[PDB]
Amino acid sequence: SRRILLPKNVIVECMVATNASIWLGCGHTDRGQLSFLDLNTEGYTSEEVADSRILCLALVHLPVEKESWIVSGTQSGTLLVINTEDGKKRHTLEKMTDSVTCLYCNSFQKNFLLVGTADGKLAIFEDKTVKLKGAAPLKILNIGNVSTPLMCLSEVMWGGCGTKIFSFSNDFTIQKLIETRTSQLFSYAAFSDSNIITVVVDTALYIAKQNSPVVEVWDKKTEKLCGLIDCVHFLREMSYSGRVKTLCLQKNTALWIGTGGGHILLLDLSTRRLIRVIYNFCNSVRVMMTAQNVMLVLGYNREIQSCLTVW
Amino acid sequence: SRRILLPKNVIVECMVATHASIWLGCGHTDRGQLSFLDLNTEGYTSEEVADSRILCLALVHLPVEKESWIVSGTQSGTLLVINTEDGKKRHTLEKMTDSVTCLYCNKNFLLVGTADGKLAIFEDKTVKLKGAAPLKILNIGNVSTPLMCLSVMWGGCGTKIFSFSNDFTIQKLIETRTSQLFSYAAFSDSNIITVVVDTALYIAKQNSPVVEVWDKKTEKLCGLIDCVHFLREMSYSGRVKTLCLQALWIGTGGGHILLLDLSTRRLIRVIYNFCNSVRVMMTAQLGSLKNVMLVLGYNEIQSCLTVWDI
Numbered sequence: 001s002r003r004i005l006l007p008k009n010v011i012v013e014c015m016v017a018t019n020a021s022i023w024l025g026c027g028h029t030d031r032g033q034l035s036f037l038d039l040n041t042e043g044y045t046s047e048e049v050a051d052s053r054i055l056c057l058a059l060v061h062l063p064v065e066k067e068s069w070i071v072s073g074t075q076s077g078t079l080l081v082i083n084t085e086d087g088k089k090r091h092t093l094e095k096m097t098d099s100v101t102c103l104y105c106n107s108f109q110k111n112f113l114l115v116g117t118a119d120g121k122l123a124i125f126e127d128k129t130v131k132l133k134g135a136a137p138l139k140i141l142n143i144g145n146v147s148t149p150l151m152c153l154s155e156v157m158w159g160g161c162g163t164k165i166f167s168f169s170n171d172f173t174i175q176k177l178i179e180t181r182t183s184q185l186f187s188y189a190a191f192s193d194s195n196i197i198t199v200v201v202d203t204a205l206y207i208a209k210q211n212s213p214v215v216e217v218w219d220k221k222t223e224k225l226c227g228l229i230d231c232v233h234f235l236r237e238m239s240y241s242g243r244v245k246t247l248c249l250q251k252n253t254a255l256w257i258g259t260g261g262g263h264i265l266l267l268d269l270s271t272r273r274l275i276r277v278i279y280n281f282c283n284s285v286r287v288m289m290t291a292q293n294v295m296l297v298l299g300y301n302r303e304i305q306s307c308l309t310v311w
Numbered sequence: 312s313r314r315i316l317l318p319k320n321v322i323v324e325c326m327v328a329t330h331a332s333i334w335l336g337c338g339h340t341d342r343g344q345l346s347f348l349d350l351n352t353e354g355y356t357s358e359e360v361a362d363s364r365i366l367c368l369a370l371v372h373l374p375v376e377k378e379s380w381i382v383s384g385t386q387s388g389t390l391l392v393i394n395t396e397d398g399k400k401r402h403t404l405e406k407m408t409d410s411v412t413c414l415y416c417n418k419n420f421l422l423v424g425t426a427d428g429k430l431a432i433f434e435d436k437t438v439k440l441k442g443a444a445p446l447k448i449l450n451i452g453n454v455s456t457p458l459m460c461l462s463v464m465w466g467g468c469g470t471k472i473f474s475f476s477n478d479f480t481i482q483k484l485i486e487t488r489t490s491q492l493f494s495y496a497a498f499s500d501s502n503i504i505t506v507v508v509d510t511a512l513y514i515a516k517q518n519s520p521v522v523e524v525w526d527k528k529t530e531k532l533c534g535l536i537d538c539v540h541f542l543r544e545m546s547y548s549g550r551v552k553t554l555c556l557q558a559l560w561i562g563t564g565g566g567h568i569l570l571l572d573l574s575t576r577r578l579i580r581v582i583y584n585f586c587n588s589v590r591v592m593m594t595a596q597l598g599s600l601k602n603v604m605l606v607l608g609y610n611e612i613q614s615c616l617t618v619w620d621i
């Protein structure tokens with residue numbers, strides 16, 4: 001477990017991993033800047049590639065044809081595809097009607113690129129179609145509206161749009177649609193009336209909402225509230241906000257929770273709750289993900305100093 | 312609303328009002344000290360009446376025979392009955408096997424809940440008799456589950472809510488630990504300290520900032536009220552110390568008082584720093600057509616009694 005310091009004032013909007021290295025979208029700029037970090041040598045290189053800020057990233061790998069493409073979704077709705085080996089090979093897919101707020105690589109075996117936009121729409125591209133300039137999506141699901149950004153996808157596929165949890169399968173039709181804005185058992189009502197920022201899929205659905213310290217647990221079948229995890233009370237065992245910023249699952253039982261501060265919780269999901277707690281791991285946990293085995297945690301301190309801890 | 316400052320370092324464990332004046336059990340002493348406060352003149356008098364700390368008070372009024380008796384249940388299990396008019400008229404009922412942790416006035420009856428999970432029932436008249444035995448003793452819990460609140464009659468014993476109407480059968484028995492699935496586990500695994508009954512059961516647990524709301528019929532959780540989150544709209548503990556219906560009043564471990572709506576579970580009023588710690592909050596009848604709200608808090612200790620009209 002070592003910490004790699006990014007250059008000063010670098011802000012990381014988004015992250016994808018692949019001498020291990022990671023691709024980063026820069027948030028300290030209004031244009032689209034793509035950065036590359038060698039996890040071994042801690043070397044950092046960047047390049048302005050788009051006109052608007054890069055919101056999320058995805059890595060589409062084609063085993064046949066032996067080619068890896070890095071896909072950047074931008075604030076203007078542009079999907080910029082760049083070749084990993086030869087940067088001179090780059091093109092653009094079909095422009096989205098709003099900003100690209102989610103990029104996911106799914107498999108059904110057929111591979112797909114799911115693209116969630118800020119106007120509540122979900123575009124689906126096929127694995128091969130990513131290579132084609134101006135390529136059109138196979139389908140576009142109108143799940144929400146301009147006020148309900150589609151911000152997270154997890155794997156059947158579950159996703160978060162506004163205050164709704166949606167599900168879809170092979171045929172790409174929305175099967176389950178669960179409204180999480182209202183529940184009588186809510187410990188506090190104002191927290192639940194916020195957009196869902198992350199969804200992790202296990203036996204139940206564990207969701208977190210913007211500026212909310214309460215991780216909600218909903219059932220797939222009954223579509224009702226299974227439970228509540230109040231990070232404020234777990235942290236107090238005192239002025240912590242407990243605002244959840246990221247959720248990450250370990251192999252089967254453990255769930256990682258990054259809070260608005262630099263606190264990281266590790267909870268068991270079978271019969272008890274609390275396993276491990278690390279206070280002041282940073283000033284603010286921003287991203288937390290698993291890569292191939294390996295845990296990556298991107299935080300920032302504030303001038304701004306972004307750091308990437310890995311173990 | 313007016314405040315009455317009690318003498319310095321006076322600690323009030325229990326409280327009961329009569330017509331205006333109030334009776335207090337003292338908690339700043341290891342013996343059983345009973346105090347009397349005139350709400351008009353703010354005069355304070357006290358007397359050591361028992362060997363162990365007076366834990367709970369009750370006021371048994373007999374309209375026929377025209378007699379008021381003050382009953383004190385203590386840490387040793389003694390039930391001391393004293394005449395309101397003549398202090399020399401005092402006696403002791405049957406000793407309880409553990410400390411008396413609840414006294415309620417409900418034909419009229421006196422319910423006596425003890426720390427070993429038992430509930431003894433006395434009739435209205437039998438309080439006058441020296442060494443009188445209870446009509447019945449219900450063994451609801453054990454030595455580890457104290458019966459600490461009563462409000463058909465509902466009550467709290469350990470982590471269970473019990474119900475009874477005609478004094479010889481425990482009707483409902485609901486386990487409230489089951490709420491571990493919602494908003495915290497350690498808070499739900501605590502003894503019930505207060506229960507208020509309007510349409511659902513609003514219960515609070517020791518060292519818990521979460522008021523649970525349970526259904527009478529389905530015997531399941533209706534809702535949760537997290538005082539920490541309501542207070543933050545920052546280091547407040549939010550530990551609930553008292554509940555009282557009017558709307559629902561909630562006194563917290565701090566000096567904060569919440570006033571919430573029942574039908575909507577919305578926030579009506581919030582009074583920050585009403586004192587340093589709210590301890591007791593109740594309604595009293597200080598005379599004919601006189602409904603009054605009493606709040607006992609404390610702030611090196613200075614206990615204060617705020618009083619206003621409803």
Ligand SMILES: [Pt+2]
Nearest residue numbers: 014015056057
């Ligand atoms: Pt991302």
Ligand SMILES: [Pt+2]
Nearest residue numbers: 152153198199
């Ligand atoms: Pt996500």
Ligand SMILES: [Pt+2]
Nearest residue numbers: 248249289290
């Ligand atoms: Pt993850």
Ligand SMILES: [Pt+2]
Nearest residue numbers: 325326367368
């Ligand atoms: Pt009492």
Ligand SMILES: [Pt+2]
Nearest residue numbers: 460461505506
């Ligand atoms: Pt009570």
Ligand SMILES: [Pt+2]
Nearest residue numbers: 555556593594
């Ligand atoms: Pt009350």
